Amino acid sequence: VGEALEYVNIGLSHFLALPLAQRISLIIIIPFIYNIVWQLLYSLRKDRPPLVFYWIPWVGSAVVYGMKPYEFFEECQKKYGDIFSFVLLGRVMTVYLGPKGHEFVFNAKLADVSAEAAYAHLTTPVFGKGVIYDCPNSRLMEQKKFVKGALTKEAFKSYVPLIAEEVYKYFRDSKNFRLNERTTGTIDVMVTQPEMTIFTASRSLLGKEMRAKLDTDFAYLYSDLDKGFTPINFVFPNLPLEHYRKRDHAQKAISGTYMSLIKERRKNNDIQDRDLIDSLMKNSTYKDGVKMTDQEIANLLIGVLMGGQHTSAATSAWILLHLAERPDVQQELYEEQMRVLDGGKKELTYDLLQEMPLLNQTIKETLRMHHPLHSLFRKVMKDMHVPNTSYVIPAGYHVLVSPGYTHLRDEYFPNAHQFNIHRWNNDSASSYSVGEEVDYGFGAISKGVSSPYLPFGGGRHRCIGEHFAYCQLGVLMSIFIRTLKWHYPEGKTVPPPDFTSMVTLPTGPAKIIWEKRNPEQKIGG
């Protein structure tokens, strides 16, 4: 019976001929049926880690992952252990939880994975081109060296009074404070902290000129650039809407202002050591001998400040929120402040910051309970074997590492969900290499990445801003502590994190009430 083949033919014709009702209905029910079958087949393969089950094709587990990612990882971990996959808006994520997860993704060979491949679609439109994830990795490595060159301890001794000047200036003039006119008030930390962060960062990393442009309408351009830095730009990076354009406008606009200042500096020889602009001018020639274009330098500046803006500001928000219900921790930090700065007589210096271990433990502890990035990604370039398993992660897959999840595990942190800065007694450093090191182009960093506290990651893509963040957060918190007490409004406590955004920032409005420690103190100027 090719008479049966006559009928696949006939049947095919009747399919194309039935009402639109059933056809759309079939255009739905066929993919739904197919993927459900496909998964059951997949669950038989054992060169593949267990795939989380999902009903909606393409979308996969994006809803629950997007909303409560650590909760997703946990029930996932109970069911399948530390390695498992799940489908996310078209892509396939293989999650490896714990320190071996860190090792498998952060220390992965350059050939196995790509961060550029994972991130460029989201970062390049915001930062500019020619830099970060819009160049070969080797270039990235040299840029990180260029930037890290302006992040030296002597830069930090110069940044500390600039940053303090800013915080004080903010207490003086900001509508949310007015310390020379108010002794008490309410602020939204989600409003205060991003302004405080951009002011301090701008002033210290981009110099006084660029800090000054933030008082004008120009500031709004940073705010535009800011909203194009969203996970939506990670799925649909370019659809003709409209926040997508103001972003691009802002990119050239902001990048324009930097080149303007850069070109005028080389043209007057105004190239001192003031900021990162001076520094990137004096030092941005690759080792093959190519030099960064003035455009490229500017774009590297947008990227630095943008990255540093969101992590830092979220973190100082959390510090305020956790402290707001711990007058005991405030009392303790204040005593240290009095001891190290001789009641206040001594002026804050980068050196003196290092003698404030409790202040540094608070940043350490907050960064433990609140990692700004719940998920780091790579695209898999070559089929990877997972040690001590038969598992193969084929190329074209994505790997996902999550040190912020381990941070919150009792196993590695007794009472992980309690805020306790004393868990870091005689252990206050931003991080430290528990042994041997390795150098990827931007200096010797730890070779192992099996530390269960890994706030800044590791491997070639490891953060180079930890000492800047601590410096800024250090000055900022030091001053808050000496100037203010603060607490929650009645019946208000720590907000749950909003995971859907770029950084795990708190769910606003997150309000605290400040009062002056010295009502009659006046900030001068």
Ligand code: HEM
């Ligand atoms: C609390 C503050 C911060 C935290 C928790 C943090 C966290 C991280 C993490 C986890 C990574 C690795 C990402 C990955 O491997 O996929 C990273 C990378 C990086 N961070 Fe930070 N960061 C912070 C502040 C900063 C600051 C202030 C700067 C700039 C001054 C900065 C610049 C960078 C750069 C340039 C990379 C390199 C990424 C790469 O090479 O692929 N970060 N950061």
Ligand SMILES: CC(C)(C)[C@@](O)(CCc1ccc(Cl)cc1)Cn1cncn1
């Ligand atoms: C890729 C992404 C998650 C946005 C990112 O890791 C990387 C951002 C980033 C990358 C390169 C430069 Cl030169 C500056 C900032 C977030 N982040 C981490 N530390 C600071 N920002």
